[PDB]
Amino acid sequence: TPAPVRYPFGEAVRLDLHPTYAELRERRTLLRVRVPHGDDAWLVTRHEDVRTVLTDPRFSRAAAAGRDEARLTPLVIRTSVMGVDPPDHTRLRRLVATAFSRRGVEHLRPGITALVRRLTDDMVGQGPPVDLVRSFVTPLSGLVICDLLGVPYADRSRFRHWLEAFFSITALPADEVAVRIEAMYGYIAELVALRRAEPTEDLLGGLVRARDRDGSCSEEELVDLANVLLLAGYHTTASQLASSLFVLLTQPEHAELLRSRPELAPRAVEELLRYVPLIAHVTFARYATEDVWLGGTLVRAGEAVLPAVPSANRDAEVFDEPDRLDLTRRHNPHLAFGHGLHHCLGASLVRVQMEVALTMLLGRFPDLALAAPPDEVPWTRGMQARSPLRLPVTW
């Protein structure tokens, strides 16, 4: 075995990718790395290779629960359906599959559309400058997931504080991480109790009824599933949208192109998903459960692999001019939502929020531009998903 290389190669800076990813793809080899916590791993950088570790059955995500799992976070996160194999993965995802399907999410489009109008109504009447993150991005994805899930949006003052700790690499000490995480699990348990004697017409109410009258999940499985859905809808989506807004505001000829032809929006959303490196470094580790050869390496049973999804999304053997934003690309087999068995449950929900938000924003503010130099936009530091912390704009 090679002497392991330090990983992360460095701090993730704005939306730039480290040069080592490009070199690794060309070499066609995995890199033995030593990560901030847990086992050593293999880093996987090519598209065809990230596809394999994400969904090949010889690579297990449940096996990582029985290990000191190779990770960037000080504490192992319970990842609900993202951390299990079949048959447990089937049984749990069955319980949420229909509400997140494309036809299911389409029934929310009038409400998201109505919400985006309310939010931009307010920008129009307040006048520039506006922090686009505070006045648009966080309300939108916050209110959409809170209404769908049942979580009180008015409770964001208390639970938004604990949300950060599930994403923290270096931003929080391990003790503060354990305190917030347990505070978050108590708060979800609060809401679940509320549904036992007052049922609700929302996703959380459906999940308690599936536990209480079908016994399809344990009580902790219910709480983990509720937490992951709130993390991904409140934080991961607002990070991608703010990042996508940064790209369009600093590459404004592409903004103007999307604005002048708003029917590109479905292609522009997929391309903004491919091009934006949302994942700061890597997604969740897999452990091989038998010997697997790939990237010049026989990965042995018991060994960890780390999929570098943003690097796969720049792979020159799948995407023409991969490092150039092409909002018109027609076929776009990106891995920004994962691949295969654990492909992102909220995929359609994110698409519809992004198409609607980008269309109205560009439409209602044809002269929209940043109100500060792109280099002085501040960025989240030491977190698992990249995002601007403020997006000052004018029009």
CA 384, distance to chain mean position in Å, is 9
Provide the phi-psi class of 307: left if phi over 0, else alpha when psi is between -120 and 50, else beta: beta
Confirm or deny that 146 is annotated as ligand binding.
Answer: no
For ligand HEM, which is the closer residue by CB, 189 or 344? 344
**CB-based burial, 376-387: b 16+ in 10 Å, e otherwise:** ebebbeebbbbb
Confirm or deny that 283 is annotated as ligand binding.
Answer: yes
For ligand HEM, which is the closer residue by CB, 38 or 338? 338
Rg (CA), the chain: 21
For ligand HEM, which is the closer residue by CB, 168 or 240? 240
Least distance to ligand HEM from the beta carbon of 231, Å?
8
For ligand HEM, which is the closer residue by CB, 88 or 176? 88
Confirm or deny that 89 is annotated as ligand binding.
Answer: yes
Least distance to ligand HEM from the beta carbon of 155, Å?
17
Least distance to ligand HEM from the beta carbon of 123, Å?
22
Least distance to ligand HEM from the beta carbon of 175, Å?
27
Least distance to ligand HEM from the beta carbon of 236, Å?
5
Helix (H, G, I), strand (E, B) or coil at 44: strand
Least distance to ligand HEM from the beta carbon of 186, Å?
21
Q: Please give the Cα distance from 239 to 252 (Å, whole number).
A: 20
Residues of the chain with a following break (C to N over 2.5 Å):
none
Give contact residues for ligand HEM (rule: CB under 6 A).
54, 81-82, 93, 145, 228-229, 232-233, 236-237, 240, 278, 283-284, 309, 336-338, 342, 344-346, 349-350
For ligand HEM, which is the closer residue by CB, 128 or 322? 322
Q: Please give the Cα distance from 163 to 235 (Å, whole number).
A: 8
Confirm or deny that 342 is annotated as ligand binding.
Answer: yes
Confirm or deny that 217 is annotated as ligand binding.
Answer: no
Helix (H, G, I), strand (E, B) or coil at 77: coil
Least distance to ligand HEM from the beta carbon of 366, Å?
25
Least distance to ligand HEM from the beta carbon of 124, Å?
26
For ligand HEM, which is the closer residue by CB, 74 or 142? 142
Q: Please give the Cα distance from 345 to 255 (Å, whole number).
A: 28
Which position's Cβ is nearest ligand HEM?
A: 346
For ligand HEM, which is the closer residue by CB, 82 or 368? 82
Confirm or deny that 286 is annotated as ligand binding.
Answer: yes
Cβ-proximal residues to 198 (8 Å cutoff; 6+ apart), any chain: none
For ligand HEM, which is the closer residue by CB, 56 or 176? 56
In this structure, the strands spanning 41-44 and 304-307 are parallel
Q: Residue 43 in contact with residue 64, Cβ under 8 Å?
A: no
Quickly list H helices, the chain: 19-27, 47-55, 88-93, 97-100, 102-106, 109-126, 132, 138-149, 156-163, 174-197, 203-209, 219-231, 237-250, 252-260, 265-275, 309-312, 347-364
Which parts are annotated binding residues for heme b? 89, 93, 283, 286, 342, 344
Which parts are annotated binding residues? 89, 93, 283, 286, 342, 344
